[PDB]
DNA sequence: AAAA
DNA sequence: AAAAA
């Protein structure tokens, strides 16, 4: 048969080392797991400890301002899992701030994302289109994946998350070309 | 679209015979 | 056998050595053209087809 | 590889803030979670309290009457979840009324929608074609997503729901164009 | 992004009202839930009561004999669910009779259909090609969805089922046309 | 919307009657449920009784030797289910013998197949490319679906399995042609 | 209908015999199940015994250095299952070494992969693009599938795994060509 | 007499 | 008669 040379969420060629940390979900001060970096990123966790609280946590990237174009495509792929059921759901998030943030602003926009959730394992390979021009001058737009729950269950989580911004495209070897 | 460099593997033969296999061979 | 007789300057009929008689031979080269892909994946690749009348 | 620039349910660029409310399912008077607004909408809930009853609840939009065309495409994406199993199913709904409604009319049309339902989590990214011309003159057509159950279980629900009407199309950045 | 204007199982523009009934599965006399009607149909149930037995139940349509063509495509979309596990599976069915049937004939042909089945919820959006010319002259061909189980569990079921016959095609609004 | 006239595993127009039988899984002598027949086949079971053992069972077809071509596509669609969990997995199988076989040869080739498996229900609609020329002259190649388990659980199974060999193609009615 | 002649992860025409072995997961010395071989491979296991530990295990292939091209596509298909829940997740791995390795180097790159995971069964048919040029001269790049868990559960596993490198393409019989 |  | 017409 022929190869499908067409896919969603082309992944970065290098990944960050596996780490472990403890976070507390928040509604108005949702923490960020890592320092945001330009365009794509991919990270994995050995043990992510979540305390009992209400709110969300997010993995965030910084939008590239070059190649002026308001509408751009953002993609995500993540296989988060654990030993118990933590009763959470996920969606994309957009927010902006004037400085490098360690948390998420109280006001943000959510974008629906369709994945799979059997018991406590979440897998998704979706993508969406998000505006990139800031609403207030002098700010930087941030996009990422947020895990939200109305009542978290104390436990530990492990998996891998990858985010990409489609500002350019990647070429691959096609033997018939 | 491409005649000379797609048809044949060498040039025209104007010279002495090169191959002798014992008779006609097609 | 017919080569040995030919070296002496003689000739043999096709009934002498019981060989088939050749009537005609034709030789030609086959060419064609190319077709271009126009979708997202195959924009830039080509496929060749050979069609020659004789 | 190449990007898939083709998707179902292009999402609105802005989302409503997360809210909490309590509803009671009904068969002939199914409540509407929010005031219907023109064309697309996306909303999220922190705690949606459902009492024990029979019937359904719906999130509704108002169909845009401009660009006269009877057949149009409507899309949906929703990741509803919770802490317990509430034994429900979902489908699209079409109904019309002469005034702005707070509930659903007793007579309505249902359209099949194919999603995923493991235990109490529902995820879907489907779309369908629905007629937009009103049957009775002077009315406005309403389309949305309805969650139906023959016997609801008392509990609380959380998630995000988004509805779109395909009257126009959205452009995005294609680096190879 | 662009819209996907391509889908399986275009749905009827009108649906039948929700009803409730009780049936008994049978191997040679599988009951039909509703009176078959020409080409497409879509129906929903509030409470479908199934007794403990062995066999199947079916929702059937009548094939349109016009536009003489032996091979045609039939599609299905259904989200059947319940409160307990009834241990069933589903497939397409083809049979013919000289009169309007209330049950399924002892001899029939089954066509594989690929859906999803977590615990007792079944969701599918598949389609298949089925011959339409009758084997014996003077008969009418019938096609539908059959739920089969070697040992049913007493319980009640609810959901929605839709069947379509692709004899013509439906046009929709494409803003770029 | 438009119809998708493109699918995997076009199904046979006639199906075998439902049957019941008892088998014992084997590692080197895996039994065959039915007598292999040329090219496509589709069968359904009311009660398939499996004893406690280790190994696999298979449903096999005979490859058509006409239309000399080494590489050909084989497809499968099956919705096997039951009342309990039997802890099994499935894959495609290729083997050849000089006579009509009742079991599977000790040496065979396996091809990965991606489906769905919630608790004990397996659904798949995949396809793959397999070589058809025999390795040893005078033999006939056999292809089918094999269910394998390192430790089977005694129980009964029911469902439907269909296999097809793509040596020709099927035409269908396209109203716009 | 028409055949889909387009698929991900074209599979090798021959498979390795089923084997059984015992491994211990490791974080910095993740073991390799089989000796890596050039380009594609497919293997199946009857009983894979995993001890209680933290880390991962991998099935690895050796990248073909011919046909100089940095970016190439790698595909995977695997249906791993078992009798109990071992609480694991999977992703692609890239690493290089100067000699034939029996384990995985402490430093490696992970690529997200989207599959399905109900209780302890994992199924996936995804693919990704990975760079093939070595970072340090005189080394050979290795790519494979890694199963990772922060706390493994003692048990036994069975299934089939297949890996392919897209350096060339496979032709198949198309009856309409 | 050979480029038989 | 393999060697652009």
DSSP string, A18-66: PEEEEE--BSSS-BBSS---BS-EEEEEEEEEE-S-SEEEEEEEE----
Shortest distance, CA A14 to any CA of chain D (angstroms):
16
CA of C9 to C1' of H2 (A): 14
**How many CA atoms, within 13 angstroms, populate the side-chain half-sphere of residue B17?**
4
CA of B18 to C1' of I4 (A): 23
Which residue(s) pair with E122 in the sheet? Answer: E80, E117
Task: Please state whether at least 3 CB pairs lie below 8 Å between chains G and A.
Answer: yes
Shortest CA distance to A166 belongs to which of A78, A73, A66, A65?
A: A73
Shortest CA distance to G152 belongs to which of G49, G60, G77?
A: G49
**Cβ–Cβ contact C1 with B under 8 A:** no
CA distance A144 to A135: 18
Q: Which single residue is written with the structure tokens 């943030």?
A: A101
CA distances from E117 to A18, D82, D122, E145, E160 (A): 35, 20, 13, 16, 15
The tokens describing C25, both together, are 């031979």
Which residue(s) pair with C4 in the sheet? Answer: none
CA distance G44 to G46: 7
Task: Please state whether at least 3 CB pairs lie below 8 Å between chains B and C.
Answer: yes
Nucleotide nearest to B4 (CA to C1'): I4
Task: Note whether D112 and E160 are within 8 A (CB).
Answer: yes
Shortest CA distance to D22 belongs to which of D115, D117, D109, D152?
A: D152
Task: Please state whether at least 3 CB pairs lie below 8 Å between chains G and F.
Answer: yes
CA distance E104 to E96: 9
**How many CA atoms, within 13 angstroms, populate the side-chain half-sphere of residue C51?**
4
CA of A98 to C1' of H1 (A): 101
Q: Which residues contact F77 (CB under 8 A, 6 or more apart)?
A: E112, E113, E114, F9, F11, F124, F125, F161, F162
CA distance E163 to E140: 17
> Cβ A72–D172 below 8 Å, yes or no?
yes
**Angle at Cα A172 formed by Cα A171 and Cα B1, nearest 5°?**
90
Tell me the chain G residues in contact with residue A15 when contact means C-beta distances shorter than 8 Å: 109-111
**Angle at Cα G130 formed by Cα G126 and Cα G134, nearest 5°?**
150
Tell me the chain G residues in contact with residue A83 when contact means C-beta distances shorter than 8 Å: 87, 151
**Cβ–Cβ contact A169 with C under 8 A:** no
> Cβ A173–G150 below 8 Å, yes or no?
no
Q: Which residues contact F82 (CB under 8 A, 6 or more apart)?
A: E87, F120, F121, F155, F156, F157, F158, F159
Best interface-test mutation with F: which of E8, E112, E124 has the largest number of F CBs within 10 A?
Answer: E112
**Cβ–Cβ contact C29 with B under 8 A:** yes
The residues on B that touch C, with CB distances below 8 Å, are 1, 6-7, 23
Q: What is the DSSP letter of A12?
A: P
Q: What is the resolution of this structure in A?
A: 2.6
CA of B8 to C1' of I4 (A): 9
Which residue in the set E69, E88, E113 is minimally distant from F173, CB to CB? E69
Query: Residue A11 CA to chain centroid, in angstroms?
Result: 13
D99 C-beta neighbours (distance < 10 Å), count = 7
- Work out whether strand F127-131 and strand F122-124 pair parallel, antiparallel, or are unpaired: unpaired
Task: Please state whether at least 3 CB pairs lie below 8 Å between chains G and B.
Answer: no
**Angle at Cα D39 formed by Cα D36 and Cα D45, nearest 5°?**
50
Best interface-test mutation with F: which of G19, G79, G80 has the largest number of F CBs within 10 A?
Answer: G79
CA distance G25 to G4: 40
Tell me the chain F residues in contact with residue E152 when contact means C-beta distances shorter than 8 Å: none
Residue of G nearest to A75 (CA): G112
> Cβ F169–G158 below 8 Å, yes or no?
no
Order across the sheet with D89-97: list the strands.
D55-62, D140-149, D89-97, D109-111
Measured in degrees and rounded to the nearest 5, phi and psi for residue A83 equal -95, -25
Tell me the chain A residues in contact with residue C39 when contact means C-beta distances shorter than 8 Å: none
**Cβ–Cβ contact A174 with C under 8 A:** yes
> Cβ D79–A111 below 8 Å, yes or no?
no
CA distances from A159 to A114, D79, G91, G120 (A): 18, 20, 9, 15
Burial G82-121 (b: 16+ CB within 10 A, else e): bbeebbbbbbbbbbbeeeebebbeeebbbbbbbbbbbbbb
> Cβ E109–F46 below 8 Å, yes or no?
no
Tell me the chain G residues in contact with residue F30 when contact means C-beta distances shorter than 8 Å: none
- Work out whether strand A19-23 and strand E2-3 pair parallel, antiparallel, or are unpaired: unpaired
> Cβ E11–D149 below 8 Å, yes or no?
no
> Cβ D111–E2 below 8 Å, yes or no?
no
**How many CA atoms, within 13 angstroms, populate the side-chain half-sphere of residue C39?**
6
Chains that touch G (3 or more CB pairs under 8 A): A, F
Task: Note whether E79 and D91 are within 8 A (CB).
Answer: yes
The tokens describing G146, both together, are 């890694």
> Cβ G71–A7 below 8 Å, yes or no?
no
CA distances from E106 to E29, E71, F78, G161 (A): 7, 24, 23, 43
Measured in degrees and rounded to the nearest 5, phi and psi for residue E108 equal -155, 165
The tokens describing C47, both together, are 């496929």
CA of B16 to C1' of H3 (A): 4
Footprint of strand H on the protein (CB under 7 A): B 14-17; C 7, 9
Shortest distance, CA E98 to any CA of chain D (angstroms):
31
- Work out whether strand E109-111 and strand E89-97 pair parallel, antiparallel, or are unpaired: antiparallel
CA distance D78 to D91: 12
The residues on D that touch E, with CB distances below 8 Å, are 5-8, 10, 27, 54, 67, 69, 71-73, 87-91, 107, 109-119, 126-131, 148-151, 166-170, 172
Which residue in the set D2, D10, D44 is minimally distant from A6, CB to CB? D2
Task: Note whether E120 and F3 are within 8 A (CB).
Answer: no
Beta strands in chain F (DSSP E): 2-3, 6-7, 19-23, 41-50, 55-62, 71-82, 89-97, 109-111, 116-117, 122-124, 127-131, 140-149, 155-166
Q: Which single residue is written with the structure tokens 């359209």?
A: D111
Residue nearest to nucleotide H2 (CA to C1'): B16
Q: Which single residue is written with the structure tokens 């790698």?
A: G74
Measured in degrees and rounded to the nearest 5, phi and psi for residue E48 equal -105, 110
Mark out the alpha helices in chain G (DSSP H runs).
none
CA of C30 to C1' of I4 (A): 13
Which residue in the set A67, A109, A129 is minimally distant from D170, CB to CB? A129
CA distance D10 to D165: 9
Shortest CA distance to A88 belongs to which of A130, A53, A47?
A: A53
Task: Note whether G104 and G93 are within 8 A (CB).
Answer: yes
Task: Note whether F153 and E147 are within 8 A (CB).
Answer: no
CA distance D91 to E159: 9
Task: Note whether D140 and D134 are within 8 A (CB).
Answer: yes
Shortest CA distance to E46 belongs to which of E160, E173, E161?
A: E160
Task: Note whether E12 and D112 are within 8 A (CB).
Answer: no
Tell me the chain A residues in contact with residue C36 when contact means C-beta distances shorter than 8 Å: none
CA distance D62 to E175: 19
Task: Give rounded-to-5 percent helix, strand, coil for chain G.
Answer: 0, 50, 50
CA of D44 to C1' of H3 (A): 93
CA of C47 to C1' of I3 (A): 26
| B23 torsion bin: left (phi>0), alpha (psi -120 to 50), beta (else) | left
> Cβ A177–C41 below 8 Å, yes or no?
no
Shortest CA distance to A161 belongs to which of A75, A76, A94?
A: A76
CA distance F127 to E120: 27
């Amino acid at each position: 048969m022929f190869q499908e040379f067409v896919s969603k969420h082309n992944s970065p060629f290098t990944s960050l080392p596996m780490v472990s940390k403890s976070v507390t979900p928040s509604v108005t001060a949702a923490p960020i797991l890592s320092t945001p970096r330009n365009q794509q990123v991919t990270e994995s966790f050995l043990d992510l400890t979540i305390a009992t609280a209400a709110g969300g946590i997010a993995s965030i990237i910084s939008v590239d301002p070059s190649a002026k174009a308001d509408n751009q495509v953002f993609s995500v792929c993540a296989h988060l899992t654990g030993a118990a059921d933590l009763k959470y759901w996920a969606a994309l998030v957009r927010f902006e701030s004037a400085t490098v943030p360690t948390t998420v602003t109280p006001t943000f926009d959510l974008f629906p994302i369709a994945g799979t959730y059997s018991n406590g394992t979440y897998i998704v390979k979706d993508c969406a289109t998000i505006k990139t021009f800031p609403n207030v001058a002098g700010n930087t737009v941030y996009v990422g994946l947020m895990l939200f729950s109305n009542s978290w269950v104390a436990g530990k989580l492990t998996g891998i998350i990858s985010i990409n911004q489609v500002r350019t495209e990647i070429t691959t070897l096609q033997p018939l070309k | 679209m491409a005649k000379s460099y797609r048809r044949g593997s060498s040039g025209k033969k104007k010279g002495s015979r090169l191959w002798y296999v014992g008779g006609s061979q097609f | 056998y017919r080569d040995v007789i030919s070296s002496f300057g003689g000739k043999t009929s096709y009934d002498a050595d019981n060989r088939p008689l050749l009537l005609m031979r034709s030789n030609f080269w086959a060419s064609g053209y190319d077709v271009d892909g126009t979708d997202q994946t195959s924009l830039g690749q080509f496929s060749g087809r050979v069609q020659q009348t004789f």
